[PDB]
Amino acid sequence: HMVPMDKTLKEFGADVQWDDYAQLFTLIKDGAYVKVKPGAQTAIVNGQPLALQVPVVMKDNKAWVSDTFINDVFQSGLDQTFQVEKRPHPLNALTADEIKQAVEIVKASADFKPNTRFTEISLLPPDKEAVWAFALENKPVDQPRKADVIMLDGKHIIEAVVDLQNNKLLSWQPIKDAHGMVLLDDFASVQNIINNSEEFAAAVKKRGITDAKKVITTPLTVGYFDGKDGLKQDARLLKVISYLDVGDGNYWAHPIENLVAVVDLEQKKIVKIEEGPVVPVPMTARPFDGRDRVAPAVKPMQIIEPEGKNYTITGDMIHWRNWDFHLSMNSRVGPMISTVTYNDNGTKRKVMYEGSLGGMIVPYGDPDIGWYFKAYLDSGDYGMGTLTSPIARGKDAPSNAVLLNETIADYTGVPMEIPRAIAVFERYAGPEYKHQEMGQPNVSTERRELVVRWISTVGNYDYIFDWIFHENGTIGIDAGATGIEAVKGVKAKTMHDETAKDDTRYGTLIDHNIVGTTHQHIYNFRLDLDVDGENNSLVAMDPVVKPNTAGGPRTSTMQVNQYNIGNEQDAAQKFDPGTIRLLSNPNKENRMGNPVSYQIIPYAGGTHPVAKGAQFAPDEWIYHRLSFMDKQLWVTRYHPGERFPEGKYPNRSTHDTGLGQYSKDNESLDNTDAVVWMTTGTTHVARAEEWPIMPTEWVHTLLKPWNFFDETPTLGALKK
Amino acid sequence: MVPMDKTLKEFGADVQWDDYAQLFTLIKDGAYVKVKPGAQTAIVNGQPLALQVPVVMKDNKAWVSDTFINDVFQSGLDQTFQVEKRPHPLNALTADEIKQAVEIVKASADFKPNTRFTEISLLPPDKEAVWAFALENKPVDQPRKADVIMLDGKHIIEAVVDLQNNKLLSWQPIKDAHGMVLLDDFASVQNIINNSEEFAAAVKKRGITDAKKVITTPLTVGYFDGKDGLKQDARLLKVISYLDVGDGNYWAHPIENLVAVVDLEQKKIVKIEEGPVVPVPMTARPFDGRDRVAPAVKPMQIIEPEGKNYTITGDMIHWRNWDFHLSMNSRVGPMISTVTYNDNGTKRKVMYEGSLGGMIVPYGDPDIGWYFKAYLDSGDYGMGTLTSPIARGKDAPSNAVLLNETIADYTGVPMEIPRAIAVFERYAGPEYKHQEMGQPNVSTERRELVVRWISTVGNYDYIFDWIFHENGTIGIDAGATGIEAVKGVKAKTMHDETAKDDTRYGTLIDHNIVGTTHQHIYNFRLDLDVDGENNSLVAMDPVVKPNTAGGPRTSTMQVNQYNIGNEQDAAQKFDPGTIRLLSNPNKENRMGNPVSYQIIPYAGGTHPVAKGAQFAPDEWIYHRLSFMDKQLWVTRYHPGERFPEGKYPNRSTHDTGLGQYSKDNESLDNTDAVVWMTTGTTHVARAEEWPIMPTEWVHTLLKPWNFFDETPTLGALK
Ligand SMILES: [Ca+2]
Ligand SMILES: [Ca+2]
Ligand SMILES: [Ca+2]
Ligand SMILES: [Ca+2]
Ligand SMILES: [Cu+2]
Ligand SMILES: [Cu+2]
């Protein structure tokens, strides 16, 4: 019963290290750190001995293992990283069984139409309160599991609710005027449609394209210009931008400028072709995969935890130090962090009921035909959860990460398993604290952070989201941006060319005939923080320079002007990093009679210029439709139905259905259930260093405990 | 033969025994060693080493040759360090040179008995001769020269010596300059307070039983134009006192409203300032864990089993496309010099010299024990001197290389700081990534080289990271930790009568203790030479402009670009939404764009940001330190202008730093410029920062902007 170890392990996804000197094999895979000596009747798993009936065999310089090796060793039980959940958590995402079950319920529905698509199949949230009672009192929820089924019947949106427990269809509801998000088959349609269009073919041949089979299209939302674009609000449309495939594995580097096709997805036809001046396609091969590069040798570097991880994953609940939280996946927004508690000397304190991406937008600034309408709502319009990019083990996440698989429903209602969907990893983050008192023994502690990382790629854009749990109570939310730049074909080769000036009015000349058009990356996070309870108040603390009225030589002082933010409209604001914004529990105080709070920091830095607001005049539509892009901070009363900053059905939206609507009522934020919305972004002005591929650029956000604790949270257990 | 564990742990080597594989894994800096008991060979950084004497196990205790460490760690297999046959001209003064410099000034007829040395540093050869050495290996063909600054009681004298020729080049007393605080100043203060009956009396009033338990702190007094009632003439220090309650944290027991002014020359207290009696906060607040038990953790290691990607030849560090010189200064700490980027076999100049410029920690309380607090920790206390030896694995990751550094003490005697600087490479997420749908992923990991330095002055612990990104970006982060300077107050809780007044200038972080609001302002002096000496400052302001091109759009995203022509205009506030470049108007990239470096003074922070000086413009602190209120500064290169706060900041009556350097408002058009980045925080306290402060960080960045012709990390073309 034997197999060549090296192949089997690689294929298994285990890292295999052979030590000639020590005559030892080191195998690493997620929480499992294994040591095995050829011929040995014992293997070490996370520092624990494991008897092998069939030893590893070295034959003719090749290692061989039993057909049972991987299972016996990896799934030995010595790897305690993953545990079995006894009592299922109320927020566990729909299982593949439940997905199939939900699809069969609506399919067996009277009104179900064949060819209906599933934009989203998600767990319908149990009552927030029953869920907290479950997490804190382990009180069973006791309301049937329900699933939300959102379908696209051609261009129409219907909303169904299925009672899974009972296998019952609870509601069927047509949603008038709403457009559905772009589904994967849309991509294939656009390309086919362009391929079959005779006129298109003609437009491309007059633009110097010899092989019209070499044209690569991209499916783009058209937005809404109040008909100004000349597009019927009624039609299910997509704009089409095309590139030429020159085989360098980078079509994005070969734009066919000033050629736009409008596709009626309902009609499966090209309803309009916008042609502008002819710009020769930049033809030079610009591979980013290294196919033309010399691969330099670097010395090995590995981060190891030879005895296993400090965290435990039981079902979807992650336990690490004083942190407890539930981790699930949504096809639209991706990762969802729930029932986040902080174990304070045996008392689990509520920090966040649920936290997740709210939505995002990538608006362009070029008014030309191939650009003016670009303002991507990649989660809303494209489904970021669905588009998750599997973690490239060790490059995308450090070598000591644990990679989780996540299951979602595809647009057809068939369960889909995303491999290495989320990376979980503990990391050294410098000294937690230090004090080297003169002529005294040093006092230093190392800082440890638990990172939850997720990557989603939409078109040319690659997004990385890190949910960072600081051992001291702080929570960081970082977002990195990489991928390939959306570029404009231009005549200028250099800034010395006559068209250079006009060519670069809207972006930098990053290569010969290539302009990296300016745009912004705007991210919004939806954080339902419950600071040591549900009832919270928004408080402002503005550090000010006030005149010295107390005497002495000082002409001024540093004081703070503190005040509550009473309702939603006042809560919706720009964030001055020089100021302090707390979410406090007016009902609970720390040892000093100070209200337990969390400090909200929407702007904690970045590596690209900061997006001060949306870089759109206020008379602009995009600007209108989407208010979330302009304020950095928003606070709203908790509504189980208000989850998207851009609104639920942003495709060709005619008005603010997102944050503009949620606060529109200007309700009270006094001693009530608040939801924090943090907006952060970059203004991306290009440079040659970002072509052919872009270096990840990061933006940081932070949530810090503020009088939440009574002292340094990391000091340690008192022996007193 | 010796006990291996002892010998090794005594050597500073980490020892791991693997009972399963019967293997010893020994680590120290760049040395990654694997040895098996009884083996005739060992492994050093992946290379086999013949052993004279195999490791011997006795009583299940290992034994080694008294030659082992040498034989193995100094084998030559660990190539982390290399021999420097031609010393770099910026090499810092050696112990011998420190000793010889001291001899030379002591031999002058002018040397006064009891003279102290505030600073003894290299007077480097000329900037062009240094660049010629680094780039062309052209010898400076010069004699080492040293700058020797002495404190004759309270008098500053500046001398220059020629180390080869062993001669005094100059002797120059500095009129009106006060010298920085020397270590001995610390003990004279305590001593002087101890001997003061009056002082002892004041303490007595204040409820202090044993005056022997009183801990003083020697504080700079600044300059109030005489409103502090202090003579400008006198060498003074103010004294704040704490009571030692045996918790190892005197800082937690302030004696409020008792201030003593000491004349270090007269060696006596010249003034006692008494305010209202505030009982001393007595509750024991140890920060050293004497009272705690840490939660057990599973081991984590970062190993580089084949050694490091960098080489250290003398002080020359070579890593990937980066080449730079690291040296120590007693005032400012580390100096990063002759920084070049090896662009496909061609070294392009990035930075002639970069270091800490200076820094300030100014308080916002107008009260007697606070109003004067404006700590210039590097200029006034010597941060390089006060370097905190890295706590291996805690202060820096387990894969760091800890360097020892030598400077001169205040008596002119060489002083070697162990684990002065940490050098470490780290995984920084994906360098770049593109997961083209339905295609094989394209991902690369990002690697960063960090040069970390910690300095502790009084209650503050300062961490500085000089981060080399493989892609050409240079990051500069500053971490802040330690113990907070607190105020004793009568309120125990926010519900006390006095709670409101008590907290007027800071948060109530403990019973009877207020973390007094203050700022942390860092200034970095960066002599960037972007692909050359002659550069220009260019503003690129992203703007929304009305659309004139047609179609449905009302507006467009454009840039307002223009040159910043002189020092006054270059002296400004930084908008993180704008772009500031240092361009070489003499060189461009393949797209005809001038090679540049994007300057980012504010790249983020974990504490509220200091947008300016949290001071009224009529404030004396404000007047003296202009650097505090502008985030960006650019001045013409001048070897004598290195400090934001000026050379002699103690009791300065006016700005002799950046205020003076740009004063003349010279042109910055196609000339040798020096960038100064001011970054800060506004620290409003929390209970979570007491009794020890969780490290807070600030970030700054320098990114290549059209310096390259493409992604700098794709690699060489096949
Ligand atoms: Ca509302
Ligand atoms: Ca809430
Ligand atoms: Ca320069
Ligand atoms: Ca000048
Ligand atoms: Cu971008
Ligand atoms: Cu501080």
Swiss-Prot record, chain A:
<keyword id="KW-0106">Calcium</keyword>
<dbReference type="Pfam" id="PF02727">
    <property type="entry name" value="Cu_amine_oxidN2"/>
</dbReference>
<dbReference type="GO" id="GO:0048038">
    <property type="term" value="F:quinone binding"/>
</dbReference>
<feature type="binding site">
    <location>
        <position position="530"/>
    </location>
    <ligand>
        <name>Mn(2+)</name>
    </ligand>
</feature>
<dbReference type="GO" id="GO:0009308">
    <property type="term" value="P:amine metabolic process"/>
</dbReference>
<keyword id="KW-0560">Oxidoreductase</keyword>
<keyword id="KW-0732">Signal</keyword>
<feature type="binding site">
    <location>
        <position position="521"/>
    </location>
    <ligand>
        <name>Cu cation</name>
    </ligand>
</feature>
<feature type="modified residue" description="2',4',5'-topaquinone">
    <location>
        <position position="461"/>
    </location>
</feature>
<comment type="similarity">
    <text>Belongs to the copper/topaquinone oxidase family.</text>
</comment>
<dbReference type="GO" id="GO:0008131">
    <property type="term" value="F:primary methylamine oxidase activity"/>
</dbReference>
<feature type="binding site">
    <location>
        <begin position="376"/>
        <end position="387"/>
    </location>
    <ligand>
        <name>substrate</name>
    </ligand>
</feature>
<dbReference type="InterPro" id="IPR015798">
    <property type="entry name" value="Cu_amine_oxidase_C"/>
</dbReference>
<feature type="binding site">
    <location>
        <position position="674"/>
    </location>
    <ligand>
        <name>Ca(2+) 2</name>
    </ligand>
</feature>
<feature type="binding site">
    <location>
        <position position="674"/>
    </location>
    <ligand>
        <name>Ca(2+) 1</name>
    </ligand>
</feature>
<dbReference type="InterPro" id="IPR016182">
    <property type="entry name" value="Cu_amine_oxidase_N-reg"/>
</dbReference>
<dbReference type="GO" id="GO:0005507">
    <property type="term" value="F:copper ion binding"/>
</dbReference>
<dbReference type="InterPro" id="IPR036582">
    <property type="entry name" value="Mao_N_sf"/>
</dbReference>
<dbReference type="InterPro" id="IPR000269">
    <property type="entry name" value="Cu_amine_oxidase"/>
</dbReference>
<dbReference type="GO" id="GO:0019607">
    <property type="term" value="P:phenylethylamine catabolic process"/>
</dbReference>
<dbReference type="Pfam" id="PF01179">
    <property type="entry name" value="Cu_amine_oxid"/>
</dbReference>
<feature type="binding site">
    <location>
        <position position="665"/>
    </location>
    <ligand>
        <name>Ca(2+) 2</name>
    </ligand>
</feature>
<feature type="binding site">
    <location>
        <position position="667"/>
    </location>
    <ligand>
        <name>Ca(2+) 2</name>
    </ligand>
</feature>
<dbReference type="InterPro" id="IPR015802">
    <property type="entry name" value="Cu_amine_oxidase_N3"/>
</dbReference>
<dbReference type="InterPro" id="IPR015800">
    <property type="entry name" value="Cu_amine_oxidase_N2"/>
</dbReference>
<feature type="binding site">
    <location>
        <position position="662"/>
    </location>
    <ligand>
        <name>Ca(2+) 2</name>
    </ligand>
</feature>
<comment type="function">
    <text>The enzyme prefers aromatic over aliphatic amines.</text>
</comment>
<dbReference type="Pfam" id="PF07833">
    <property type="entry name" value="Cu_amine_oxidN1"/>
</dbReference>
<feature type="binding site">
    <location>
        <position position="568"/>
    </location>
    <ligand>
        <name>Ca(2+) 2</name>
    </ligand>
</feature>
<comment type="pathway">
    <text>Amino-acid degradation; L-phenylalanine degradation; phenylacetate from L-phenylalanine: step 2/3.</text>
</comment>
<feature type="binding site">
    <location>
        <begin position="458"/>
        <end position="463"/>
    </location>
    <ligand>
        <name>substrate</name>
    </ligand>
</feature>
<keyword id="KW-0801">TPQ</keyword>
<keyword id="KW-0464">Manganese</keyword>
<feature type="active site" description="Schiff-base intermediate with substrate; via topaquinone">
    <location>
        <position position="461"/>
    </location>
</feature>
<feature type="binding site">
    <location>
        <position position="684"/>
    </location>
    <ligand>
        <name>Cu cation</name>
    </ligand>
</feature>
<feature type="binding site">
    <location>
        <position position="673"/>
    </location>
    <ligand>
        <name>Mn(2+)</name>
    </ligand>
</feature>
<protein>
    <recommendedName>
        <fullName>Primary amine oxidase</fullName>
        <ecNumber>1.4.3.21</ecNumber>
    </recommendedName>
</protein>
<feature type="binding site">
    <location>
        <position position="528"/>
    </location>
    <ligand>
        <name>Ca(2+) 1</name>
    </ligand>
</feature>
<comment type="subunit">
    <text>Homodimer.</text>
</comment>
<keyword id="KW-0479">Metal-binding</keyword>
<keyword id="KW-0574">Periplasm</keyword>
<dbReference type="GO" id="GO:0005509">
    <property type="term" value="F:calcium ion binding"/>
</dbReference>
